[PDB]
Amino acid sequence: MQANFGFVTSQTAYVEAGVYRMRYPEIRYPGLIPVDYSAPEW
Amino acid sequence: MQANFGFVTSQTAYVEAGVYRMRYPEIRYPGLIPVDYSAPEWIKTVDYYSMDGVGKAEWIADRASDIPVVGLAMEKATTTVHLAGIGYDYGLEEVNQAIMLGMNLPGEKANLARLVYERMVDRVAFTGDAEKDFKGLFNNGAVTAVSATTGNWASATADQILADFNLGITGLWSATNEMVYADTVLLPSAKHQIIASKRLGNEATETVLQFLQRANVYTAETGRPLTIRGMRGLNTAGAGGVSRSVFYRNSPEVLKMHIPMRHRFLPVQVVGLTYKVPGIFRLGGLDIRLPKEVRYVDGY
Amino acid sequence: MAPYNETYASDYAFAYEGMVSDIAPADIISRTVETSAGIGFGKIVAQGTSDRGCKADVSAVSPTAPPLGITVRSQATENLTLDKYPRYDGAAIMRKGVIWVLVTDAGGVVAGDPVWLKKSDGTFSNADVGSSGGLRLAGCRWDTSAANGALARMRVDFDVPPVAGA
Amino acid sequence: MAPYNETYASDYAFAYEGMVSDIAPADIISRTVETSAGIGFGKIVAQGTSDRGCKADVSAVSPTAPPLGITVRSQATENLTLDKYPRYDGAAIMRKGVIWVLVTDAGGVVAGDPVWLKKSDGTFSNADVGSSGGLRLAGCRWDTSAANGALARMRVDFDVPPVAGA
Amino acid sequence: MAPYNETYASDYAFAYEGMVSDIAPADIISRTVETSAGIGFGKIVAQGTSDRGCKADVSAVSPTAPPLGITVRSQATENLTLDKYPRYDGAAIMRKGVIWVLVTDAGGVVAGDPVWLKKSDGTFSNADVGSSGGLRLAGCRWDTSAANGALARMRVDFDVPPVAGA
């Protein structure tokens, strides 16, 4: 888990295309809890 | 079984034209393990990239400087690729003499070398050698292996069979925090027989237990079919020598096996009335990237 | 497409080793790394011999020679040392803000606690070690309850002189 | 279409009694068989009385009269003796390569072990018999772990003089 | 256009650490590296526990458990370890040819000398250490006069059993 924006690319290595993002559960609230936004926002 | 290139025949005898070759089990890796041949023939490692972020939100009010912050990160991972090989030889009086009987000795060896080639690739893909530490699909030590719910599948009613079968899918769903579905099931072949033969515990219609094909958890929540196969080496792969079955997703992002170079043959070296012939290849061990997407159920 | 080190976490984590949390004030100070190996991100540092350098060795800090500050997570650091400030590099020390650090204590810490430094290794804890091998960073406090070996954010002020504890 | 001796094996076997494994060096030597019966394929041989002959009888070998070598699987051998070199035939002795042989030991052998010859029958084993009836082939070693009565490949060098063991 | 490590040498050097010198015979053997770190090029190796593996640790070799051979300079070795065979890699051991190695002796060596191995580190020298910590590789000899810490080529034959020297 390095955090340096930088990676070394070897001359005798093969790189696969595409990056993988870690998965998090779905959001599940819309459609089950009625939510409104009609109030003046302050 | 002898090795003499010769048998005594007679004049009043009819020798049949064909020859029976001793049988060996099928190959069974194509179609179950994703393999690719895209990498260059002589490469050394395969590496690849991921990323994740992290933050937290908080209750703040009344003109304060306290407002929390987020952050990001990245990561890289590596595997290796190695070389192996097999080839044959013969003497000067083994080949000029096996043409007298029309046997074509050198030509019979290359075919069988390719056969043993495929045998080796299969064994590496599905088991482990403990010389290069190539853990296989049936004995990987990073995946979770649970027992069955008191099910032997002999003297067991259809309720137990269905419960045991769906245990694997539900466990794979609960082991990844309810995110993924099992796509493929591999069972020992005897158990596949027991399922395919036993009726559904019905006097009413006597339909087979392969009603499971349309009423399992995966095929029920979604519309996609489920694939069930019977394998060969799963008879005693369990914790105490018991049968093992595997539930997994069968995607190129879960399993991966690279084979840059396939089996080829090199020219013939000649040394003192002996023709030494080499032959080489190179592959990379199987790589289970997501170990929570593979599940072992023992005791069926 | 790298799925290694997948743990299927319930929700997002809190922070990383040396990340800061936004607030208006912060003394961030540029120093030059003097140790042969690098210096980690959330770490304490002492006063170097180069009149603007810093060392990761805090085995000899005292009330007369107080520690200098705490490094921060930079994310642009030469990609040869994984998460460190390489030798001869700007260090970005912080001595006023609130920063996430690593806890080294058996029972953990809670919201408002003293911060004790173990001079032997340079780890933060809740109580004194007990053999003249710990300092108390007088102006410092925690801001999170955390268990052993977890990340907790603390508020830091290095102008207050430290207190020696035997 | 001969299905007798079908065992439905899991996978291919390893080798046969006297087959070699490819490698660049090999001293293969042509000798003439002197015993009335033939000589088996993976067997030890002694020095004959015909100045180029060999015998399968190694009951009298000593450090002063070392054994000659090991025969190899020829596959073109007169079809009257099943797998043997008949009397008065080129023998093809080997004394440098790596060859598959048969193990005669209770506990089996592992990768690197001494090779001991039992002069009474001419069988290879791991340890000395213990009654002045065994030799040690000084330059020789195993290359496979194998159980009793199985095939194991060993590396052989017959120019190193043998060692007598009582 | 890299001019660092320029010494303006009088003429070409002789060889590198583990390079071979051409000759018709050579047993080159494929083994798998077992040590966590790699193995250098001109180095001695012992018999591994994997039935085809090798280790760089020769602190326990004896006449009963002789060393296995000497690695050779491969020049295609994964570019992550500078000049080594990484873990889990084909090792290419040699046990018959003539190879350049490094001398560790005070007075140096001359053309025909015994080769003594120091079991503590695994270095070659001219005479025995003197505390039951050295072996003599019985079939081995030098082929060049060289000073301390220089490259000398030696002729090697590992089928001859070693000799223990106290």
Side-chain angles (χ1 to χ4, degrees), chain E residues 25-57:
Chain E
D27 285 310
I28 302 273
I29 286 181
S30 331
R31 290 324 191 198
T32 302
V33 182
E34 257 192 69
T35 10
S36 129
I39 290 168
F41 280 161
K43 299 289 94 175
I44 200 162
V45 278
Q47 191 2 304
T49 104
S50 177
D51 195 60
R52 277 186 71 136
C54 61
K55 56 173 62 167
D57 183 275

PDB file of all heavy atoms in Angstrom, chain E residues 25-57:
ATOM      1  N   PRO E  25      33.664 -30.521 -21.900  1.00  0.00           N
ATOM      2  CA  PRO E  25      32.762 -31.086 -20.888  1.00  0.00           C
ATOM      3  C   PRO E  25      32.248 -30.019 -19.933  1.00  0.00           C
ATOM      4  O   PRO E  25      32.953 -29.057 -19.618  1.00  0.00           O
ATOM      5  CB  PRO E  25      33.652 -32.088 -20.150  1.00  0.00           C
ATOM      6  CG  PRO E  25      34.951 -31.440 -20.194  1.00  0.00           C
ATOM      7  CD  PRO E  25      35.063 -30.837 -21.570  1.00  0.00           C
ATOM      8  N   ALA E  26      31.012 -30.197 -19.479  1.00  0.00           N
ATOM      9  CA  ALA E  26      30.482 -29.444 -18.352  1.00  0.00           C
ATOM     10  C   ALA E  26      29.195 -30.106 -17.894  1.00  0.00           C
ATOM     11  O   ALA E  26      28.261 -30.247 -18.687  1.00  0.00           O
ATOM     12  CB  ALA E  26      30.230 -27.983 -18.728  1.00  0.00           C
ATOM     13  N   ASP E  27      29.139 -30.514 -16.631  1.00  0.00           N
ATOM     14  CA  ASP E  27      27.870 -30.823 -15.978  1.00  0.00           C
ATOM     15  C   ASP E  27      27.296 -29.523 -15.436  1.00  0.00           C
ATOM     16  O   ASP E  27      27.778 -28.972 -14.449  1.00  0.00           O
ATOM     17  CB  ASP E  27      27.997 -31.870 -14.878  1.00  0.00           C
ATOM     18  CG  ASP E  27      28.177 -33.259 -15.424  1.00  0.00           C
ATOM     19  OD1 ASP E  27      27.363 -33.625 -16.290  1.00  0.00           O
ATOM     20  OD2 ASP E  27      29.080 -33.993 -14.985  1.00  0.00           O
ATOM     21  N   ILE E  28      26.256 -29.044 -16.097  1.00  0.00           N
ATOM     22  CA  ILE E  28      25.458 -27.935 -15.611  1.00  0.00           C
ATOM     23  C   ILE E  28      24.127 -28.513 -15.162  1.00  0.00           C
ATOM     24  O   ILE E  28      23.476 -29.248 -15.913  1.00  0.00           O
ATOM     25  CB  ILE E  28      25.274 -26.863 -16.695  1.00  0.00           C
ATOM     26  CG1 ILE E  28      26.636 -26.354 -17.166  1.00  0.00           C
ATOM     27  CG2 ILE E  28      24.438 -25.718 -16.163  1.00  0.00           C
ATOM     28  CD1 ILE E  28      27.188 -25.223 -16.354  1.00  0.00           C
ATOM     29  N   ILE E  29      23.734 -28.211 -13.933  1.00  0.00           N
ATOM     30  CA  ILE E  29      22.593 -28.855 -13.303  1.00  0.00           C
ATOM     31  C   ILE E  29      21.589 -27.798 -12.881  1.00  0.00           C
ATOM     32  O   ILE E  29      21.949 -26.757 -12.327  1.00  0.00           O
ATOM     33  CB  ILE E  29      23.037 -29.698 -12.093  1.00  0.00           C
ATOM     34  CG1 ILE E  29      23.730 -30.965 -12.560  1.00  0.00           C
ATOM     35  CG2 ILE E  29      21.866 -30.037 -11.213  1.00  0.00           C
ATOM     36  CD1 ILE E  29      24.158 -31.826 -11.428  1.00  0.00           C
ATOM     37  N   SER E  30      20.317 -28.074 -13.142  1.00  0.00           N
ATOM     38  CA  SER E  30      19.234 -27.156 -12.822  1.00  0.00           C
ATOM     39  C   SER E  30      18.700 -27.463 -11.430  1.00  0.00           C
ATOM     40  O   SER E  30      18.158 -28.547 -11.199  1.00  0.00           O
ATOM     41  CB  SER E  30      18.115 -27.269 -13.851  1.00  0.00           C
ATOM     42  OG  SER E  30      18.633 -27.674 -15.107  1.00  0.00           O
ATOM     43  N   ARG E  31      18.840 -26.506 -10.516  1.00  0.00           N
ATOM     44  CA  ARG E  31      18.286 -26.615  -9.176  1.00  0.00           C
ATOM     45  C   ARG E  31      17.418 -25.397  -8.911  1.00  0.00           C
ATOM     46  O   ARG E  31      17.475 -24.402  -9.634  1.00  0.00           O
ATOM     47  CB  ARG E  31      19.375 -26.711  -8.100  1.00  0.00           C
ATOM     48  CG  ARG E  31      20.172 -28.001  -8.080  1.00  0.00           C
ATOM     49  CD  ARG E  31      19.340 -29.210  -8.431  1.00  0.00           C
ATOM     50  NE  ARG E  31      20.051 -30.450  -8.149  1.00  0.00           N
ATOM     51  CZ  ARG E  31      19.721 -31.628  -8.663  1.00  0.00           C
ATOM     52  NH1 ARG E  31      18.712 -31.715  -9.510  1.00  0.00           N
ATOM     53  NH2 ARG E  31      20.416 -32.710  -8.353  1.00  0.00           N
ATOM     54  N   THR E  32      16.608 -25.481  -7.863  1.00  0.00           N
ATOM     55  CA  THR E  32      15.725 -24.396  -7.465  1.00  0.00           C
ATOM     56  C   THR E  32      16.248 -23.745  -6.192  1.00  0.00           C
ATOM     57  O   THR E  32      16.555 -24.422  -5.210  1.00  0.00           O
ATOM     58  CB  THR E  32      14.301 -24.903  -7.239  1.00  0.00           C
ATOM     59  OG1 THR E  32      13.822 -25.529  -8.433  1.00  0.00           O
ATOM     60  CG2 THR E  32      13.386 -23.758  -6.890  1.00  0.00           C
ATOM     61  N   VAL E  33      16.338 -22.423  -6.214  1.00  0.00           N
ATOM     62  CA  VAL E  33      16.900 -21.660  -5.106  1.00  0.00           C
ATOM     63  C   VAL E  33      15.942 -21.703  -3.928  1.00  0.00           C
ATOM     64  O   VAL E  33      14.742 -21.453  -4.075  1.00  0.00           O
ATOM     65  CB  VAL E  33      17.185 -20.212  -5.535  1.00  0.00           C
ATOM     66  CG1 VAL E  33      17.823 -19.443  -4.399  1.00  0.00           C
ATOM     67  CG2 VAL E  33      18.073 -20.204  -6.755  1.00  0.00           C
ATOM     68  N   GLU E  34      16.475 -22.014  -2.747  1.00  0.00           N
ATOM     69  CA  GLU E  34      15.657 -22.161  -1.554  1.00  0.00           C
ATOM     70  C   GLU E  34      15.858 -21.072  -0.513  1.00  0.00           C
ATOM     71  O   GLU E  34      14.985 -20.900   0.344  1.00  0.00           O
ATOM     72  CB  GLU E  34      15.917 -23.520  -0.891  1.00  0.00           C
ATOM     73  CG  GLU E  34      14.827 -24.541  -1.143  1.00  0.00           C
ATOM     74  CD  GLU E  34      14.966 -25.755  -0.250  1.00  0.00           C
ATOM     75  OE1 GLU E  34      14.747 -25.618   0.970  1.00  0.00           O
ATOM     76  OE2 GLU E  34      15.289 -26.846  -0.765  1.00  0.00           O
ATOM     77  N   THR E  35      16.970 -20.342  -0.555  1.00  0.00           N
ATOM     78  CA  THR E  35      17.217 -19.305   0.436  1.00  0.00           C
ATOM     79  C   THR E  35      16.279 -18.126   0.213  1.00  0.00           C
ATOM     80  O   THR E  35      15.870 -17.835  -0.911  1.00  0.00           O
ATOM     81  CB  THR E  35      18.665 -18.829   0.361  1.00  0.00           C
ATOM     82  OG1 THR E  35      19.278 -19.368  -0.815  1.00  0.00           O
ATOM     83  CG2 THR E  35      19.441 -19.298   1.571  1.00  0.00           C
ATOM     84  N   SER E  36      15.935 -17.441   1.306  1.00  0.00           N
ATOM     85  CA  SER E  36      15.027 -16.302   1.211  1.00  0.00           C
ATOM     86  C   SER E  36      15.618 -15.198   0.345  1.00  0.00           C
ATOM     87  O   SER E  36      14.970 -14.710  -0.587  1.00  0.00           O
ATOM     88  CB  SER E  36      14.707 -15.775   2.607  1.00  0.00           C
ATOM     89  OG  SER E  36      14.923 -14.384   2.671  1.00  0.00           O
ATOM     90  N   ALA E  37      16.844 -14.782   0.646  1.00  0.00           N
ATOM     91  CA  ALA E  37      17.592 -13.947  -0.278  1.00  0.00           C
ATOM     92  C   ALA E  37      18.127 -14.808  -1.419  1.00  0.00           C
ATOM     93  O   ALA E  37      18.061 -16.039  -1.382  1.00  0.00           O
ATOM     94  CB  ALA E  37      18.737 -13.234   0.438  1.00  0.00           C
ATOM     95  N   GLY E  38      18.650 -14.152  -2.443  1.00  0.00           N
ATOM     96  CA  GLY E  38      19.155 -14.877  -3.583  1.00  0.00           C
ATOM     97  C   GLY E  38      20.434 -15.635  -3.266  1.00  0.00           C
ATOM     98  O   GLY E  38      20.820 -15.842  -2.114  1.00  0.00           O
ATOM     99  N   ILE E  39      21.093 -16.071  -4.334  1.00  0.00           N
ATOM    100  CA  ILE E  39      22.405 -16.697  -4.258  1.00  0.00           C
ATOM    101  C   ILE E  39      23.304 -16.030  -5.286  1.00  0.00           C
ATOM    102  O   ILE E  39      22.908 -15.848  -6.441  1.00  0.00           O
ATOM    103  CB  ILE E  39      22.327 -18.218  -4.500  1.00  0.00           C
ATOM    104  CG1 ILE E  39      21.638 -18.906  -3.329  1.00  0.00           C
ATOM    105  CG2 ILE E  39      23.706 -18.803  -4.661  1.00  0.00           C
ATOM    106  CD1 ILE E  39      21.262 -20.331  -3.612  1.00  0.00           C
ATOM    107  N   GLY E  40      24.510 -15.670  -4.868  1.00  0.00           N
ATOM    108  CA  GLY E  40      25.449 -15.027  -5.765  1.00  0.00           C
ATOM    109  C   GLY E  40      25.902 -15.958  -6.871  1.00  0.00           C
ATOM    110  O   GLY E  40      25.584 -17.145  -6.908  1.00  0.00           O
ATOM    111  N   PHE E  41      26.671 -15.395  -7.799  1.00  0.00           N
ATOM    112  CA  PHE E  41      27.024 -16.139  -9.001  1.00  0.00           C
ATOM    113  C   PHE E  41      28.146 -17.143  -8.757  1.00  0.00           C
ATOM    114  O   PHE E  41      27.948 -18.348  -8.931  1.00  0.00           O
ATOM    115  CB  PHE E  41      27.367 -15.172 -10.129  1.00  0.00           C
ATOM    116  CG  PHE E  41      26.160 -14.607 -10.805  1.00  0.00           C
ATOM    117  CD1 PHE E  41      26.237 -13.454 -11.554  1.00  0.00           C
ATOM    118  CD2 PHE E  41      24.939 -15.241 -10.690  1.00  0.00           C
ATOM    119  CE1 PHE E  41      25.118 -12.947 -12.174  1.00  0.00           C
ATOM    120  CE2 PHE E  41      23.823 -14.738 -11.308  1.00  0.00           C
ATOM    121  CZ  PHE E  41      23.911 -13.590 -12.050  1.00  0.00           C
ATOM    122  N   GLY E  42      29.330 -16.690  -8.368  1.00  0.00           N
ATOM    123  CA  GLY E  42      30.327 -17.703  -8.078  1.00  0.00           C
ATOM    124  C   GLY E  42      30.360 -18.062  -6.611  1.00  0.00           C
ATOM    125  O   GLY E  42      31.178 -17.536  -5.858  1.00  0.00           O
ATOM    126  N   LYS E  43      29.562 -19.057  -6.235  1.00  0.00           N
ATOM    127  CA  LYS E  43      29.278 -19.406  -4.849  1.00  0.00           C
ATOM    128  C   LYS E  43      29.146 -20.916  -4.760  1.00  0.00           C
ATOM    129  O   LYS E  43      28.835 -21.579  -5.749  1.00  0.00           O
ATOM    130  CB  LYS E  43      27.967 -18.790  -4.343  1.00  0.00           C
ATOM    131  CG  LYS E  43      27.782 -17.270  -4.310  1.00  0.00           C
ATOM    132  CD  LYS E  43      28.584 -16.521  -3.252  1.00  0.00           C
ATOM    133  CE  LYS E  43      29.900 -15.986  -3.737  1.00  0.00           C
ATOM    134  NZ  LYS E  43      30.572 -15.179  -2.691  1.00  0.00           N
ATOM    135  N   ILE E  44      29.362 -21.455  -3.566  1.00  0.00           N
ATOM    136  CA  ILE E  44      29.106 -22.870  -3.334  1.00  0.00           C
ATOM    137  C   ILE E  44      27.692 -23.049  -2.787  1.00  0.00           C
ATOM    138  O   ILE E  44      27.121 -22.146  -2.172  1.00  0.00           O
ATOM    139  CB  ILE E  44      30.162 -23.470  -2.389  1.00  0.00           C
ATOM    140  CG1 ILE E  44      30.209 -24.988  -2.529  1.00  0.00           C
ATOM    141  CG2 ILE E  44      29.878 -23.085  -0.956  1.00  0.00           C
ATOM    142  CD1 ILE E  44      31.462 -25.597  -1.985  1.00  0.00           C
ATOM    143  N   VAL E  45      27.113 -24.225  -3.031  1.00  0.00           N
ATOM    144  CA  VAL E  45      25.736 -24.504  -2.637  1.00  0.00           C
ATOM    145  C   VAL E  45      25.665 -25.891  -2.018  1.00  0.00           C
ATOM    146  O   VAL E  45      26.445 -26.783  -2.356  1.00  0.00           O
ATOM    147  CB  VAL E  45      24.758 -24.404  -3.827  1.00  0.00           C
ATOM    148  CG1 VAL E  45      24.374 -22.968  -4.074  1.00  0.00           C
ATOM    149  CG2 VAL E  45      25.364 -25.018  -5.061  1.00  0.00           C
ATOM    150  N   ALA E  46      24.704 -26.069  -1.118  1.00  0.00           N
ATOM    151  CA  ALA E  46      24.472 -27.335  -0.442  1.00  0.00           C
ATOM    152  C   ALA E  46      23.180 -27.962  -0.945  1.00  0.00           C
ATOM    153  O   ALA E  46      22.469 -27.402  -1.779  1.00  0.00           O
ATOM    154  CB  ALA E  46      24.423 -27.152   1.078  1.00  0.00           C
ATOM    155  N   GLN E  47      22.886 -29.148  -0.426  1.00  0.00           N
ATOM    156  CA  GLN E  47      21.741 -29.915  -0.893  1.00  0.00           C
ATOM    157  C   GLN E  47      20.505 -29.457  -0.129  1.00  0.00           C
ATOM    158  O   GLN E  47      20.494 -29.443   1.104  1.00  0.00           O
ATOM    159  CB  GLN E  47      22.004 -31.409  -0.683  1.00  0.00           C
ATOM    160  CG  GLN E  47      21.067 -32.473  -1.322  1.00  0.00           C
ATOM    161  CD  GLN E  47      19.923 -31.969  -2.202  1.00  0.00           C
ATOM    162  OE1 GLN E  47      19.086 -31.174  -1.795  1.00  0.00           O
ATOM    163  NE2 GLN E  47      19.895 -32.453  -3.436  1.00  0.00           N
ATOM    164  N   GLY E  48      19.471 -29.068  -0.868  1.00  0.00           N
ATOM    165  CA  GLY E  48      18.272 -28.518  -0.280  1.00  0.00           C
ATOM    166  C   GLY E  48      17.396 -29.579   0.358  1.00  0.00           C
ATOM    167  O   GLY E  48      17.742 -30.758   0.439  1.00  0.00           O
ATOM    168  N   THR E  49      16.248 -29.135   0.858  1.00  0.00           N
ATOM    169  CA  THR E  49      15.274 -30.054   1.430  1.00  0.00           C
ATOM    170  C   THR E  49      14.123 -30.366   0.482  1.00  0.00           C
ATOM    171  O   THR E  49      13.212 -31.104   0.871  1.00  0.00           O
ATOM    172  CB  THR E  49      14.727 -29.508   2.758  1.00  0.00           C
ATOM    173  OG1 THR E  49      13.403 -28.983   2.576  1.00  0.00           O
ATOM    174  CG2 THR E  49      15.631 -28.411   3.312  1.00  0.00           C
ATOM    175  N   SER E  50      14.149 -29.842  -0.745  1.00  0.00           N
ATOM    176  CA  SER E  50      13.031 -29.998  -1.663  1.00  0.00           C
ATOM    177  C   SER E  50      13.289 -31.079  -2.708  1.00  0.00           C
ATOM    178  O   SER E  50      12.550 -31.169  -3.695  1.00  0.00           O
ATOM    179  CB  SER E  50      12.706 -28.657  -2.344  1.00  0.00           C
ATOM    180  OG  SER E  50      11.674 -28.796  -3.301  1.00  0.00           O
ATOM    181  N   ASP E  51      14.353 -31.865  -2.530  1.00  0.00           N
ATOM    182  CA  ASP E  51      14.709 -33.007  -3.372  1.00  0.00           C
ATOM    183  C   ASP E  51      15.268 -32.553  -4.713  1.00  0.00           C
ATOM    184  O   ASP E  51      15.892 -33.343  -5.431  1.00  0.00           O
ATOM    185  CB  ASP E  51      13.502 -33.932  -3.584  1.00  0.00           C
ATOM    186  CG  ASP E  51      13.883 -35.287  -4.142  1.00  0.00           C
ATOM    187  OD1 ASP E  51      14.653 -36.005  -3.496  1.00  0.00           O
ATOM    188  OD2 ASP E  51      13.382 -35.663  -5.221  1.00  0.00           O
ATOM    189  N   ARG E  52      15.126 -31.273  -5.030  1.00  0.00           N
ATOM    190  CA  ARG E  52      15.874 -30.659  -6.117  1.00  0.00           C
ATOM    191  C   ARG E  52      16.270 -29.220  -5.821  1.00  0.00           C
ATOM    192  O   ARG E  52      16.642 -28.496  -6.749  1.00  0.00           O
ATOM    193  CB  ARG E  52      15.091 -30.701  -7.432  1.00  0.00           C
ATOM    194  CG  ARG E  52      15.245 -32.031  -8.136  1.00  0.00           C
ATOM    195  CD  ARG E  52      14.619 -32.077  -9.512  1.00  0.00           C
ATOM    196  NE  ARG E  52      15.373 -31.267 -10.459  1.00  0.00           N
ATOM    197  CZ  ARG E  52      15.677 -31.652 -11.692  1.00  0.00           C
ATOM    198  NH1 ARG E  52      15.302 -32.848 -12.123  1.00  0.00           N
ATOM    199  NH2 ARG E  52      16.364 -30.852 -12.495  1.00  0.00           N
ATOM    200  N   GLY E  53      16.211 -28.789  -4.566  1.00  0.00           N
ATOM    201  CA  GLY E  53      16.550 -27.433  -4.205  1.00  0.00           C
ATOM    202  C   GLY E  53      17.977 -27.307  -3.717  1.00  0.00           C
ATOM    203  O   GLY E  53      18.677 -28.293  -3.496  1.00  0.00           O
ATOM    204  N   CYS E  54      18.411 -26.064  -3.565  1.00  0.00           N
ATOM    205  CA  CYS E  54      19.740 -25.770  -3.062  1.00  0.00           C
ATOM    206  C   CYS E  54      19.681 -24.575  -2.126  1.00  0.00           C
ATOM    207  O   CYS E  54      18.813 -23.710  -2.237  1.00  0.00           O
ATOM    208  CB  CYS E  54      20.725 -25.505  -4.204  1.00  0.00           C
ATOM    209  SG  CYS E  54      20.309 -24.105  -5.255  1.00  0.00           S
ATOM    210  N   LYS E  55      20.619 -24.545  -1.190  1.00  0.00           N
ATOM    211  CA  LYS E  55      20.739 -23.461  -0.233  1.00  0.00           C
ATOM    212  C   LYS E  55      22.150 -22.907  -0.313  1.00  0.00           C
ATOM    213  O   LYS E  55      23.083 -23.606  -0.699  1.00  0.00           O
ATOM    214  CB  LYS E  55      20.443 -23.927   1.197  1.00  0.00           C
ATOM    215  CG  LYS E  55      21.298 -25.083   1.652  1.00  0.00           C
ATOM    216  CD  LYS E  55      21.083 -25.402   3.115  1.00  0.00           C
ATOM    217  CE  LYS E  55      19.666 -25.826   3.377  1.00  0.00           C
ATOM    218  NZ  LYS E  55      19.564 -26.427   4.718  1.00  0.00           N
ATOM    219  N   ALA E  56      22.296 -21.635   0.029  1.00  0.00           N
ATOM    220  CA  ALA E  56      23.605 -21.003   0.096  1.00  0.00           C
ATOM    221  C   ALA E  56      24.292 -21.233   1.432  1.00  0.00           C
ATOM    222  O   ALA E  56      25.428 -20.785   1.617  1.00  0.00           O
ATOM    223  CB  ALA E  56      23.481 -19.499  -0.171  1.00  0.00           C
ATOM    224  N   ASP E  57      23.639 -21.930   2.357  1.00  0.00           N
ATOM    225  CA  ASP E  57      24.168 -22.171   3.692  1.00  0.00           C
ATOM    226  C   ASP E  57      24.913 -23.499   3.701  1.00  0.00           C
ATOM    227  O   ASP E  57      24.293 -24.564   3.611  1.00  0.00           O
ATOM    228  CB  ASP E  57      23.039 -22.170   4.721  1.00  0.00           C
ATOM    229  CG  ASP E  57      23.539 -22.337   6.142  1.00  0.00           C
ATOM    230  OD1 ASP E  57      23.731 -23.493   6.563  1.00  0.00           O
ATOM    231  OD2 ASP E  57      23.734 -21.325   6.846  1.00  0.00           O
TER     232      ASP E  57
END
